[PDB]
Structure formats: C-alpha cells, structure tokens
C-alpha cells in the first residue's frame, strides 16, 4: 500500500540484502537507506512481514532498530 515502499522492494534480492543462519537473520535494505520514512515504509514493511509469517505458522519476531542482532553479538553504530 505504499508507492515508495513497493519501489524499494523491487530492486532487492535475497542473495544480497539478506543473511540467513539458523533461525536468526539480518535483512539489510537497498541504498535508498537512511532516508527511510518510518511511518510509511519501515513500519508497513514490518506488519506485512509479521502477517506474512503468520499465514503458515512462522511467528516472525521482528525488532528493527539501528543496531544489529545476529546470533547474539550486538553492535551499535559500527561498534561491537
């Protein structure tokens, strides 16, 4: 439901922009980045993700913030 949000997804693959390991994983967006409308884009991308996993049982637990959690090694602003 977002013109901008749809545009961002099209240029995004899964070999790039996603790093899978175990049950964890980091989804790093395409370079139309910091300039991201949290009201329109990044929250509407999340509710369409958390309802996507619920239609087949996978209770996705998203927690977006500008740190990064990847198999329990946090890092904030380029610093572990």
């Amino acid at each position: 439901k977002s013109a901008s949000l749809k545009r961002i997804l099209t240029d995004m693959t899964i070999q790039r922009n996603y790093v899978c390991q175990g049950d964890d994983g980091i989804l790093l967006l395409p370079h139309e980045a910091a300039s991201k409308i949290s009201a329109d884009d990044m929250n509407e991308l999340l509710t369409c993700l958390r309802d996507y996993g619920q239609l087949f049982g996978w209770n996705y637990d998203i927690d977006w913030s500008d740190t990064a959690e990847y198999l329990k090694l946090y890092a904030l602003m380029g610093c572990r």
Binding site: A3, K6, R7, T10
Partner: protein, 48 residues
C-alpha cells in the same frame, strides 16, 4: 457504460518506472501486462 462519468485508467504502479531499461527482466513483464490490459480500460489516452 459509464465512461464520461467515470473512466478506468491504468494504475501508477502498473507502469515500469521510467529509469531502468528493458534489460531489467521483471520490469519487462510489467510492460507486457500493461499492453494486454491496455484497451480494456476506457482511458482515451491509453494508446499512448
């Protein structure tokens, strides 16, 4: 039966964005579906 009061047009997400060329493969299918559903609409500028 109601063109002139309400005219169906193709959406603004129907179109491939005007940047990338035809080498972009899923940007080509949005032009293929746009041609098949072209004259189904009642826009008079829909040939262009």
């Amino acid at each position: 039966a109601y063109n002139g009061l309400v005219t169906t047009v193709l959406s603004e997400d129907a179109f491939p964005d005007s940047s990338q060329s035809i080498t972009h493969l899923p940007s080509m299918w949005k032009c293929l579906f746009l041609t098949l559903a072209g004259p189904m609409t009642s826009d008079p500028h829909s040939p262009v």
